[PDB]
Amino acid sequence: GKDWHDLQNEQAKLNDKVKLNKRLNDLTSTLLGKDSEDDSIRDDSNILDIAHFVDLMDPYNGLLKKINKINENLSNELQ
Amino acid sequence: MTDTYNSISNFIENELTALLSSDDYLMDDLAGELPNEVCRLLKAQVIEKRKDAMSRGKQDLLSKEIYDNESELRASQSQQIMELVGIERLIEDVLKLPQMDLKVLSEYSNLRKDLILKCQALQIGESKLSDILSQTNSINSLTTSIKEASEDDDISEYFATYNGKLVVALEEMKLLLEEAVKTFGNSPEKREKIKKILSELKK
Amino acid sequence: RLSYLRDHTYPHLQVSVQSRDRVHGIEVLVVNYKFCRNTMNPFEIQFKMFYKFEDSTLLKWEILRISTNVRLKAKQLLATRNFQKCLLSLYEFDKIKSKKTGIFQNLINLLKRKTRCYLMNNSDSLIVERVTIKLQINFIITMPGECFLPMSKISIALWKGGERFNQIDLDEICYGLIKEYGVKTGLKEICNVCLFPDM
Amino acid sequence: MNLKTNNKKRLTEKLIQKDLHPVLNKADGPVTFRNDSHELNLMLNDPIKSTADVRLDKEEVLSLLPSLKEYTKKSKELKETMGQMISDSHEEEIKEVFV
Amino acid sequence: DYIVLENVYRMFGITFFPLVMLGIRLEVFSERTSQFEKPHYVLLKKRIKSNSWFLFKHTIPSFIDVQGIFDDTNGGLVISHDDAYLFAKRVFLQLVEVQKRRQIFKDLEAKKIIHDLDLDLESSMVSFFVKDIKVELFVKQNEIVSCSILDSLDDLELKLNHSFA
Amino acid sequence: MNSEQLLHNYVSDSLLTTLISFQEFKQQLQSYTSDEQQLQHWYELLQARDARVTSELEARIKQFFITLRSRLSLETLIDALYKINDLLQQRLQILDDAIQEKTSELAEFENMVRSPSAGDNAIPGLLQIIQSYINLLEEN
């Protein structure tokens, strides 16, 4: 029942983490002694770039509204 | 069916002969680096503890148990594949079908590989589309933002004249700051002006 | 009665009604809602909504004004024509952003001495440079597609100084480290691997 | 039950794997992951499904889907196009001169 | 005065009512009928000798568990109210997908494709009549696992009309 | 828990270090031989030999396993596998068609927001205004 399911999960996760440990050993050897990404399969720069793009020139927030809320407030405090 | 178990039994006997030749390989490896009389003595302790460990009945019982496990593995394989004759359930049943009348077997293996490729590319494309959907959502939010902000529907030129509005706002800020510096000259007024300038600039 | 539901049920949320009015059968409500978690730049929202005063039913709901911070972010969200997916998806967004900036600040506090560490984006991406190894931890919160909850996407990117490695294998590495550790100790193990002078 | 106790010592002899830091904390580790996967709504960089002794041929995948080859070049065109539009804004200079 | 304040508190769908103890109140707003669902009350008790919350009374349906999921977060360490909010969010997601399934059934009934129905408490053995062949289906959460024809859950409407003509 | 690690248990308990420890043949070779310090050296030699036989045994075990499973209605599943192959490629065509619309949308947006204008000329004005503001703040 649940015991055999737990044993099956154990037998799966053992080979999972020993494969993981071999990958960490390989990367540690690579790092101390010295893998590349030159394709388009899963790259995360797109969403970061877009989220910066919209926040820089947001017509509600952006910079021009912030600079306006700075300088008109300074003019109100001065005049 | 029983020929499979016969081949398992002959290979088990072959591996036992491999083990005894490996014991002889211990014997002639330890020769030279150890005295041969010491080698014969440790061979004697190997006989009186380790040689009887591979009993004749136990290896055959293990071979029979392995054959029964392989037969029930084949039965389970048949059960899943006959269930598979009849979206994520398809990819699941594909990744649990095993790997293997020579032409049918070769084409089964080849198209099995070519269909694991399709199953993998499925979640590859799914993750890519899940990213691009959020990208287009933010882009559409920005476009409707500038559309109903200016209420002029000329948003293509909005991204071209933003530099001019930016620099004239900076020039007005610079003129106001110069007027405040040359007019007020007070430490608390300058501190308050600097605090108000630096509050909403980044924070 | 009032005070407990005011604060402890929804911490760092400011609820306040602005105006009430009754017509003839429709009743109109004008209200503002402020999420004051990030007190440096909090964000609020204003709604106008309608009941019957018997079997209170939202006929129509409209946006009067949104604060300057989230007036773009809360527009793609607010096209679903369902408030329970529009105000249970903003508090979670605020809480997720708070946890993101807290995790990044705590990671600054554990690397500001030996290494250098800053934020490339506003709070989304964090860059740590050591020796000349570089690590970048991305924490993307993007709105639901148009489920309904805000979307958090943790990513890593490690350069040895000269070149970038593969993203899929490091993604599996991140999967394992977060899987048996979690978001904080897993990234701590990842930046320990970035150091790797002893451990 | 008995085999579970036989497997506990397998866990103990397993957990001394070759790593100084990244295996020395999971001796509430995965339950922390299941606790914060929902609290942050976290589904992270999801690993591609099991290879099953077939190498993950990304070349065959990009051959089978011809759309992504155009998507990546459209994205690169957008990035190279208006990163220069960012560079004409001096947001970093303003943030440096103010805070 | 206070009445509109409890309406504002109740539109969320997750509320915590103090007691002398706790009570989590859950309601799911329906987009179609423009009305809230039945209020689900979870009266939660704190252990004295263990310093951790545990379930005292529940008004949940038997299909939705409030104990297994309750110990699925933080290893049963539900002392912090953030973990209570996590449990509330998880059971709210389960409630809204179950309500979505029930609304799909009600919409297909209102479309008059089938005859009168008998909906159950678990939305698995919901029976209905078709013009010639009455089909019973064993269905999990948004997934049918058996279609017992004798004479994705939304994808049924993809194919049942195909079976209708 | 399948048969290959049953073979591994059957070979590991029949390995020499198991119930014949270092102390066992150390006591058995006390007065029998003179190389007492070399007993430890022969012992790590024993671990080395045991260590690479317990790696080369898997080669033959898995070779015979894949040979027997390779030699394992029959032709009925081929038509079903072509049915699945025709199903999934048409299924992925839907995602490809969905991606085409989004990438055309983003390509239209990128040329909609491009501004081939004098950004650098405004950049010098912004830099000059920032320098004047910095000078005023330093004087403040």
Author numbering:
A (entry chain U): 233 to 266, 277 to 321
B (entry chain Y): 1 to 86, 110 to 123, 136 to 238
C (entry chain P): 153 to 176, 179 to 285, 293 to 307, 314 to 366
D (entry chain Q): 277 to 303, 320 to 391
E (entry chain O): 162 to 181, 201 to 331, 351 to 364
F (entry chain Z): 1 to 72, 86 to 153
Give the article text:
Previous studies identified an interaction between the essential N-terminal domain (END) of budding yeast CENP-A (CENP-AEND; residues 28 to 60) and the essential S. cerevisiae CCAN proteins CENP-Q and CENP-U. Reconstitution studies further showed that a CENP-QU module can transmit force from the outer kinetochore to CENP-ANuc. We also present a structural explanation for how the CENP-A N terminus (CENP-AN) interacts with CENP-QU. Unexpectedly, the CENP-AN binding site on CENP-QU is autoinhibited in the context of the assembled CCAN. Paradoxically, in the context of CCAN, the CENP-QUFoot is sterically blocked by an N-terminal domain of the Nkp1-Nkp2 dimer. (B) Cryo-EM map of the CENP-AN:CENP-OPQU+ (COMA) complex. In our structure, the N-terminal domain of Nkp1-Nkp2 is bent back, so only its middle region binds to CENP-QU.
The budding yeast inner kinetochore also contains the DNA binding centromere-binding factor 1 (CBF1) and CBF3 complexes. The inner kinetochore centromere-associated inner kinetochore (CCAN) complex (14 to 16 subunits) associates with the centromere, generally through specific recognition of CENP-ANuc.
